[PDB]
Amino acid sequence: QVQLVQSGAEVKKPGSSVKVSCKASGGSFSSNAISWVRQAPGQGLEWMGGINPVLGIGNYAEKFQGRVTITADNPTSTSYLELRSLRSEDTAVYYCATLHPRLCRGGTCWGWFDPWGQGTLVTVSSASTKGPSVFPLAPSTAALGCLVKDYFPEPVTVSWNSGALTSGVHTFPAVLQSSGLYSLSSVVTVPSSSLGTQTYICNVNHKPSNTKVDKRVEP
Amino acid sequence: SSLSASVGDRVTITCRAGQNINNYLNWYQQKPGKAPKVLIYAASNLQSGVPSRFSGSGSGTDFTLTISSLQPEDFATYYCQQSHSTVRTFGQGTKVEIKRTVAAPSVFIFPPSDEQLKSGTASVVCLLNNFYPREAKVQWKVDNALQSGNSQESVTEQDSKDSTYSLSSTLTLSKADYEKHKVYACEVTHQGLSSPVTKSFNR
């Protein structure tokens, strides 16, 4: 009710099962008052389910009346969200939020959500972990960059000159290939006199594979 | 889903409904990278802590949410939430973008790295740097053959200090398919470009 706190990122495989928690810590709480809204990357929101006040068991959206099961542990005050038959369209950020009921004219209550959990990311692809590939991008107000071209899953960091260069640096949002791996490119604009006079090195760290590669760029 | 405005303009977002949801529409605000927070509930009830610029109205079918004067921390996405016995929807969302004057894209092209061609894949990078508005289209040409299906645009969010976008279209071929062609032209057209810029290279 004051501090909805969620489990953490889960990579899963098609046909599989995720179970996400929502801690609802702090002061007085009702774990039966937590609902679950889902957000699919790049676009808007859809509520998934809540819990019936008169029954104590879940109530879910028509699009998930199949294999969803939210459960409310009243003592430990958490809400577990279990989504199975995972597909690729089910890859999204899953929020929990405390429902403030305003009208219940079924067996279900709905009204508005006040505290929202921090959100856990469920990436589900048929692919498996792989480290990134770094390809330098050379210069001819002159730009240079690095291409991180085939890794999985999403989280990857890019630095320049081991942290010094932070001006004109960009690093774009990654794109997902039909193959299944992620690729992003990071560029920086630098003056045409510091070509050769200053060496530019980018640092790429992909912890999911413990891959920390650095590749420098020369004209 | 997108509205461009600058600090001190007044924006009001209408959110119509199909049936009669009386007073059960809420407004949420979402900033990139964070969960939603409620601003108004019960159509008009400001939630404690949200500034007084925010003003929700309407009843029955047409519902509004106004900001009397935009401030820097007002530029985020706003969803209206229907929640009735008739409809139980969220919104498409409406993104307020921070307005500026048009900027011409600084273009760059990057032929495949020597180290990359050793892998059998050959990826060509184009780069559009610091532009406004976001609306810009790149066009890949290989020997005057127009490309449409191997490229992959990805664009940033409005810069914190430039209020400008940067777009990076990447054309990826197989090493083999790469060697068959001479000209690799990346044509970009923008609002702030008097005539479309092309940045070619011969392999």
Author numbering:
A (entry chain A): 1 to 52, 52A, 53 to 82, 82A, 82B, 82C, 83 to 100, 100A, ...
B (entry chain B): 9 to 211
The authors write:
Several potent bNAbs bind a conserved HCV glycoprotein E2 epitope using an unusual heavy chain complementarity determining region 3 (HCDR3) containing an intra-loop disulfide bond. Here we report the identification of new antibodies containing an HCDR3 disulfide bond motif using computational screening with the Rosetta software. The tip of the HCDR3 loop in previously characterized VH1-69-derived, HCDR3 disulfide bond motif-containing Abs forms a β-hairpin that interacts with an epitope in the front layer of E2. The Ab HCDR3 loops interact with E2 mostly through backbone-backbone interactions of the β-hairpin at the tip of the loop.
